[PDB]
Design a protein around this nucleic acid. Structure first.
Ligand SMILES: [Mg+2]
Ligand SMILES: [Mg+2]
Lengths: 141, 57, 94, 82
RNA sequence: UUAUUGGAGGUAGAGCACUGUUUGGACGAGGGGCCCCUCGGGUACCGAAUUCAGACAAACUCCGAAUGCCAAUUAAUUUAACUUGGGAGUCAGAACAUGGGUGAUAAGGUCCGUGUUCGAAAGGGAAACAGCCCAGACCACCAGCUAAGGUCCCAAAAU
RNA sequence: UAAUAGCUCACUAGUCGAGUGACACUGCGCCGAAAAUGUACCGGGGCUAAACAUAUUACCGAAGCUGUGGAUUGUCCUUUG
RNA sequence: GACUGGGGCGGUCGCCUCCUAAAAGGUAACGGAGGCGCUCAAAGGUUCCCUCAGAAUGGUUGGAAAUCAUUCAUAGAGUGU
RNA sequence: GGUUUGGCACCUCGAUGUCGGCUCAUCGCAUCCUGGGGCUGUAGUCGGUCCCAAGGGUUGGGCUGUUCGCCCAUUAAAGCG
RNA sequence: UCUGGUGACUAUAGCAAGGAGGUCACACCUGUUCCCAUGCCGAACACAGAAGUUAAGGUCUUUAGCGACGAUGGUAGCCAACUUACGUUCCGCUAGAGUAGAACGUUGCCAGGC
């Protein structure tokens, strides 16, 4: 529907990626963060909505980041066509999420309000989730 | 060191590298069984077919 | 400073996932004292030992002969499972 | 629907069959090619001559041997059949 | 075919050193107005300057596996390999798994590589079935042991 | 709370005379779950095992393989047979 | 006239480079990006010689754009196309 | 869900006859009426929403080839497939 | 093995910084009559000289700040096999990168002076 998050293309058509597996990508900025866990990938529209939520329920300002950005398009072509001919026009952008990325992170608040806003996010995304504290990476050198 | 072999689960449906590596050992019809002296070569030639063969000694 | 240990055999095929399932943990220690060692260790008493001395404190790792003083270097944590793998020690100088 | 209306990019049969054509430990005859390439993806050494498309051959019989020079760029060098 | 040695390339993977994308900081090189001064102050946004950290890629790579591929005056096993001459058939392939493109991470889809089976191959199991699973029928026997899969009746075998 | 009067569900003596709480990864399960000739995706009967998982010994089971007999090919022993 | 995800209209029909292409090669699609149907009497040959873009600062031509000027600058330039 | 517009090209080209209406019905329930209920910003009559339930019933005409649709006048309701 | 010329070696050689020395090496260096030469220019190249000097170049010593090397361990991935349709899992080969440790202020050949 809406695609605010965008960039210079460099190219407008691309073979997809479809996810298999990974871990990692701990928290580095804030304290509290959301961990995606499971089967899907994403468009930007979704992320925007989640940001609306996470900005409202936190008054007192309260800081947010998005560690990821969609670097990839999502093509989908005219309605009720026969297959065959050249790959279709643009409709979307994509930020793939294996199990282990950390989409949303916050700090400036307590442990609770974070957790609420993150519930109110994970209902508004495909992926199952998990709540995390920044206490440890798996490497510090 | 001699070594009695026995084919147990056949070659059908299996790819050809395996198959050729079987017949290299002189392994005709199922349950056929030869006796051979041991080597790095031969045992590595078993290891490619380790599942569908036995080794007695 | 007190850790009960088993000594590892260094060819512990990927079924060592059993060890990690047992709460046991692999690790190594090196630096000034000796050349290289692989060990086992419990996770439980290790997370005790973190708070006990601190991050970079001086643990006396277990052998059975002489314990070695160490200043724990590194570990490779994994999310989705919430635990540690392959701790890294360091036999310090004096 | 069908036809409408596009490129047709695609110019898909475009082949020249490059690569390598001999190997180490291989007796070889004079005038024989070892290795096609472009630029100098491999340099020549001794007993070798290059051509007007950066091909490589052996001016004389012998045995092929590739080598390293400067941590990046290799070279090929026949050495005398005993 | 395997073992052993050597060897060309640059996928998976990983990564930011070029290409290009990107987030938040640090930011100072400095500006724009609204306004003060009236020579300067410039008070949100910024380019690049320089950097801390964290990310992305078929058409980016400082790097780089498994497999396969090429040869060995090398070794074991084994039976195939080549030329010439006579004769044809075939050029509509399908499914399963697998790496991928397209398509909607739809199709018993389509297009390629990889391998098997069917096609040209029955039989046992999958209730029933071309391709899935075990296995390759020379003929006969009122003999036996096993494979997949199964053991209460149907339906032989452990309530 | 039209607003207030609030026994108090804020705290301890009283009875009570041991469990009581909150998280972590988890196995199996429940709801979500509504079709069209007549049960209706267990194959049917039927099953709380005759289901699920782990570990074991047995056994059945094909034109496979084995035993006996016969035949043809073709390589050996070697006229043999 | 053939392709042709029925056929038609549309589009293409040869050649060069890449990617898809699965670490040799090869490997399709109405898959994704770009071109070519020439040019040179020197831009060829050969013997000698030399090393650039960018950056910093001072200075007429002041987008610090023009030549200068050193320093830093491992190729970020240029390579008929 | 497989009722629509579609994608696919697996049966059918030595023939599987397609729209709509008449007679005939039969079925599903994701209920249009009756029956029972929960909630209500339900005072009552009338209601809105949700649940169980498919036993029966679910109209005449104008207008077009008509599914559809608009309209008249009825009716407890004038069901979706 | 003190110096110098010329070769080989994956930058472990380097790069940055600082300390020391020259009339025997080399260099700066004085000059342009000739050789010759600079697109302007003896700056460069070249020829003739050796007035001055260790400043620079270059040589030696030391530094691990930069860059290159870099294991061992365990991880991702994957060849073979069993289950399974699971953005699969279990088992057996193999074995990265990143990273820590550590390594590193070169090593040898030939001639000629010494
Ligand atoms: Mg990748
Ligand atoms: Mg009338």
């Amino acid at each position: 529907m809406l695609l605010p998050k965008r960039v210079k293309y460099r190219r407008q058509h691309r073979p997809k990626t479809t996810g298999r597996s990974k871990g990692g990508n701990y928290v580095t900025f804030g304290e509290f963060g959301l961990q995606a866990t499971t089967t899907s990938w994403i468009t930007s529209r979704q992320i925007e909505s989640a940001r609306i939520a996470m900005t409202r329920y936190m008054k007192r300002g309260g800081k947010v980041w998005i560690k990821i950005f969609p670097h990839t398009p999502y093509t989908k072509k005219p309605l009720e066509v026969r297959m065959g001919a050249g790959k279709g026009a643009v409709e979307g952008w994509i930020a793939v999420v294996k199990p282990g990325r950390i989409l949303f992170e916050v700090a400036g608040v307590s442990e609770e309000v974070a957790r609420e806003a993150l519930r109110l996010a994970s209902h508004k995304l495909p992926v199952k989730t998990k709540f995390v504290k920044r206490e440890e990476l798996g490497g510090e050198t | 060191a001699k070594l009695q072999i026995t084919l147990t689960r056949s070659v059908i449906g299996r790819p050809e590298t395996q198959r050729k590596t079987v017949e290299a050992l002189g392994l005709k019809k199922t349950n056929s069984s030869v006796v051979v002296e041991d080597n790095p070569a031969i045992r590595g030639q078993i290891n490619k077919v380790k599942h569908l063969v036995t080794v007695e000694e | 400073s007190l850790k009960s240990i088993i000594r590892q055999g260094k060819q512990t095929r990927s079924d060592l996932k059993q060890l990690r399932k047992s709460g046991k943990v692999p690790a190594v220690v090196y630096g000034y004292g000796t050349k290289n060692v692989s060990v086992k260790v419990d996770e439980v008493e290790f997370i005790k030992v973190i708070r006990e001395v601190g991050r970079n404190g001086v643990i006396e790792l277990g052998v059975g002969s002489k314990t070695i003083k160490v200043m724990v270097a590194d570990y490779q944590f994994d999310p989705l499972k919430n635990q540690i793998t392959h701790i890294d020690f360091l036999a310090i100088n004096m | 629907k069908k036809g409408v209306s596009s490129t047709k990019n695609g110019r898909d049969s475009e082949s020249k069959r490059l690569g390598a054509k001999r190997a180490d430990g291989q007796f070889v005859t004079g005038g024989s090619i070892l290795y096609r390439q472009r630029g100098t993806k491999i340099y020549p050494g001794e007993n070798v001559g290059r051509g007007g498309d950066d091909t490589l051959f052996a001016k004389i019989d012998g045995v092929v041997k590739f080598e390293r020079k400067g941590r990046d760029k290799k070279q090929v060098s026949v050495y005398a059949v005993a």
